[PDB]
Design a protein around this motif. Structure first.
Motif, mmCIF file in Angstrom:
data_model
loop_
_atom_site.group_PDB
_atom_site.id
_atom_site.type_symbol
_atom_site.label_atom_id
_atom_site.label_comp_id
_atom_site.label_asym_id
_atom_site.label_seq_id
_atom_site.Cartn_x
_atom_site.Cartn_y
_atom_site.Cartn_z
ATOM 1 N N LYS A 4 -8.320 6.012 5.734
ATOM 2 C CA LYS A 4 -7.887 7.331 6.188
ATOM 3 C C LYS A 4 -7.643 7.264 7.682
ATOM 4 C CE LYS A 4 -9.832 10.595 2.840
ATOM 5 N NZ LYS A 4 -10.436 11.966 2.729
ATOM 6 N N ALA A 5 -6.768 8.119 8.191
ATOM 7 C CA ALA A 5 -6.545 8.151 9.631
ATOM 8 C C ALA A 5 -5.978 9.488 10.094
ATOM 9 C CB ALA A 5 -5.615 7.012 10.048
ATOM 10 N N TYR A 53 0.813 -1.227 0.000
ATOM 11 C CA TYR A 53 0.000 0.000 0.000
ATOM 12 C C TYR A 53 0.846 1.277 0.000
ATOM 13 C CZ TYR A 53 0.585 -0.620 5.196
ATOM 14 O OH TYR A 53 1.075 -0.842 6.468
ATOM 15 N N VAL A 54 0.244 2.372 -0.457
ATOM 16 C CA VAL A 54 0.857 3.694 -0.345
ATOM 17 C C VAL A 54 0.331 4.379 0.914
ATOM 18 C CG1 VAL A 54 1.098 5.981 -1.381
ATOM 19 C CG2 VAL A 54 1.187 3.934 -2.805
ATOM 20 N N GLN A 55 1.232 5.000 1.661
ATOM 21 C CA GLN A 55 0.864 5.682 2.886
ATOM 22 C C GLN A 55 1.344 7.109 2.810
ATOM 23 O OE1 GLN A 55 0.786 3.842 6.677
ATOM 24 N NE2 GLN A 55 2.176 5.325 7.652
ATOM 25 N N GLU A 56 0.392 8.031 2.680
ATOM 26 C CA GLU A 56 0.696 9.445 2.578
ATOM 27 C C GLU A 56 0.285 10.143 3.870
ATOM 28 O OE1 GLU A 56 0.658 10.996 -1.748
ATOM 29 O OE2 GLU A 56 -1.306 9.983 -1.619
ATOM 30 N N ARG A 57 1.141 11.028 4.358
ATOM 31 C CA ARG A 57 0.798 11.817 5.531
ATOM 32 C C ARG A 57 1.104 13.302 5.316
ATOM 33 N NH1 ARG A 57 3.073 7.987 9.801
ATOM 34 N NH2 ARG A 57 1.294 6.741 10.532
ATOM 35 N N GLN A 74 -3.625 11.369 7.389
ATOM 36 C CA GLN A 74 -3.104 10.144 6.772
ATOM 37 C C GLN A 74 -4.092 9.439 5.835
ATOM 38 O OE1 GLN A 74 -1.416 7.205 9.572
ATOM 39 N NE2 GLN A 74 -2.029 5.574 8.166
ATOM 40 N N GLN A 75 -3.583 8.964 4.699
ATOM 41 C CA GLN A 75 -4.359 8.198 3.726
ATOM 42 C C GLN A 75 -3.600 6.932 3.404
ATOM 43 O OE1 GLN A 75 -6.463 8.855 0.344
ATOM 44 N NE2 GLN A 75 -6.961 11.058 0.572
ATOM 45 N N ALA A 109 5.288 7.145 0.990
ATOM 46 C CA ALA A 109 6.016 5.933 1.283
ATOM 47 C C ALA A 109 5.333 4.700 0.733
ATOM 48 C CB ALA A 109 6.200 5.797 2.770
ATOM 49 N N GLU A 110 6.125 3.755 0.256
ATOM 50 C CA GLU A 110 5.549 2.510 -0.192
ATOM 51 C C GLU A 110 5.896 1.434 0.828
ATOM 52 O OE1 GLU A 110 6.365 1.751 -4.383
ATOM 53 O OE2 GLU A 110 5.300 3.583 -4.954
#
Ligand SMILES: [Cu+2]
Length: 221
Positions: A156-157, A86-90, A177-178, A104-105
């Protein structure tokens, strides 16, 4: 992909960062045990002394290792995207100071779970808490609140990290965060992650570095 998280899994983590005028790089190696929600890693600043405090990187530096109790396995998005990942964007907002933007991957590469991240920081104050290093070497316990958005077929977070300052203050860091899957087929009911983190040092290690032990468990049902 929850299959892949029975038993110990080794871990590699890489952080490429620019904050104002300074670039830095961080490599982490260790292992994770999703069965009990444990993480054991050591981090190195391969570029010399960090221009930010180590605690400010902790959250951008693998929630697939959160322990989900049996009665919550339906809600473990993070693992269900593996191995493809997953991709994690903040976006991270330090109150009355600068901001981090991270991409980040998180994905499997062989038998090793890999977290490859780039980080952009803007508008940090000189002699603020982040630059000029007034954060204490530790880490508080938080609840990470997780929601689904079917829109991006993901997660989402948001949550607020509390950073002890050396004078009794608390520097706050607002996390947005997504998470988006890379392959296909993964979406929880609203719940959270209670976290715990201890930081420490290897006394025979001369490079600016961070040893980290971490416990995480899901809850909310
Ligand atoms: Cu770079």
């Amino acid at each position: 992909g929850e299959e892949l998280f029975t038993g110990v899994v080794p871990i590699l983590i890489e952080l490429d960062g620019h904050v104002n005028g300074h670039h830095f790089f961080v490599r982490g190696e260790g292992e994770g045990d999703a069965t009990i929600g444990k993480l054991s890693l050591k981090f190195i600043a391969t570029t010399g002394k960090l221009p930010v405090p180590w605690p400010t990187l902790v959250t951008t530096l693998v929630q697939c290792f959160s322990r989900y109790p049996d009665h919550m396995k339906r809600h473990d998005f993070f693992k269900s995207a593996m191995p493809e990942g997953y991709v994690q964007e903040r976006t991270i907002y330090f109150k009355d100071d600068g901001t981090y933007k991270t991409r980040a991957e998180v994905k499997f590469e062989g038998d090793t779970l890999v977290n490859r991240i780039e980080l952009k920081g803007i508008d940090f104050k000189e002699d603020g808490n982040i630059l000029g290093h007034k954060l204490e070497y530790n880490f508080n316990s938080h609840k990470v609140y997780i929601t689904a958005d079917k829109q991006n077929n993901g997660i989402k977070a948001n949550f607020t990290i509390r950073h002890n300052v050396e004078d009794g203050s608390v520097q706050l860091a607002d996390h947005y965060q997504q998470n988006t899957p890379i392959g296909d087929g993964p979406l929880p009911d609203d719940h959270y992650l209670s976290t715990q983190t201890i930081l420490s040092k290897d006394l025979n290690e001369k490079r600016d570095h961070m040893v980290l032990l971490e416990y995480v468990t899901a809850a909310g049902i």
